[PDB]
Amino acid sequence: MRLNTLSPAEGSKKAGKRLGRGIGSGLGKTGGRGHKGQKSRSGGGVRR
RNA sequence: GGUUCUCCCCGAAAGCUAUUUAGGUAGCGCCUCGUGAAUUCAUCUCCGGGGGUAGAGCACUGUUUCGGCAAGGGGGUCAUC
Ligand SMILES: [Mg+2]
Ligand SMILES: [Mg+2]
Ligand SMILES: [Mg+2]
Ligand SMILES: [Mg+2]
Ligand SMILES: [Mg+2]
Ligand SMILES: [Mg+2]
Ligand SMILES: [Mg+2]
Ligand SMILES: [Mg+2]
Ligand SMILES: [Mg+2]
Ligand SMILES: [Mg+2]
Ligand SMILES: [Mg+2]
Ligand SMILES: [Mg+2]
């Protein structure tokens, strides 16, 4: 127990998705939106 | 139109329905991750079923040719009260 030996529970912290950061990321160009509809646009999508 | 580091595992759709809808979107179908559960599911063999397609046929609804039977047509001639 020193200020540089404390570590979080396992599974307690998970990295966020980061869209549009290359091929390898698995989340490049389109960023998980597919091609070219209303739902791909910034602000795009239909009301409830 | 563009969307910037890496590796591992799985892996579609371009259909149906609706839409001032048709290059948009929503539910379902197909993809993924998780949880739960029945020999649940597949192929083969044997058993039980309904069919009206392929082929065929011409009783029926239609169509078609030839021959006998000819109803009855129509043509001559006299009649034509
Ligand atoms: Mg990822
Ligand atoms: Mg990908
Ligand atoms: Mg694009
Ligand atoms: Mg399109
Ligand atoms: Mg789309
Ligand atoms: Mg805008
Ligand atoms: Mg694969
Ligand atoms: Mg179909
Ligand atoms: Mg209808
Ligand atoms: Mg039968
Ligand atoms: Mg038939
Ligand atoms: Mg036939």
Curated annotation (Swiss-Prot):
Chain segments annotated as coiled-coil in the UniProt record: none
Feature: compositional bias, Gly residues: 21-31
Chain spans, region Disordered: 1-48
Family as reported in the entry's similarity comment: Belongs to the universal ribosomal protein uL15 family.
Assembly and oligomerization: Part of the 50S ribosomal subunit.
Function: Binds to the 23S rRNA.
Protein name: Large ribosomal subunit protein uL15
Species of provenance: Escherichia coli O139:H28 (strain E24377A / ETEC)
Taxonomy of the source species: Bacteria, Pseudomonadati, Pseudomonadota, Gammaproteobacteria, Enterobacterales
Residue numbers of the full-length protein present here: 1 to 48 of 144
